[PDB]
Amino acid sequence: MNPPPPETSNPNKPKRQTNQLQYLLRVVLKTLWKHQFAWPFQQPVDAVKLNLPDYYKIIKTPMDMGTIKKRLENNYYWNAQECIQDFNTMFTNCYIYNKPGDDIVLMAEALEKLFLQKINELPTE
């Protein structure tokens, strides 16, 4: 069964726009989105659809690139590091829920490498 997806707005949280956050949307997220292995990560895990009734019994901090994209579009984050943490949570969730060598894990491994390549150098303020 599915919990509510992670919030993409929160009026009690302050918003911010920075050059680095703009880059995380325009270049990092939007390039990863087009990778051949991006599709499992473009929306919250639908445990009912995918017949993964254990998914949210295991994964307590779910995250995906659809949520990240909406957060970036909504200026939800304070800084680039907060957004980067959401990407890292997404990848770690995949490693936690699965096991080494699974096709889904090979996909996450490739995307994580591309992600790190792209965030190695960010624009300055």
Ligand SMILES: CN1CCN(C(=O)c2cccc(CN3c4cccc5c4C(=Cc4cccnc43)N(C)C5=O)c2)CC1
């Ligand atoms: C039963 N077979 C299925 C094939 N298989 C895989 O390796 C495998 C590879 C790619 C996609 C899937 C199915 N799926 C999904 C499944 C499992 C874990 C996870 C997922 C996901 C996301 C996901 C998204 C859309 C559709 N489908 C998903 N995310 C984040 C996950 O952590 C499974 C394992 C054995």
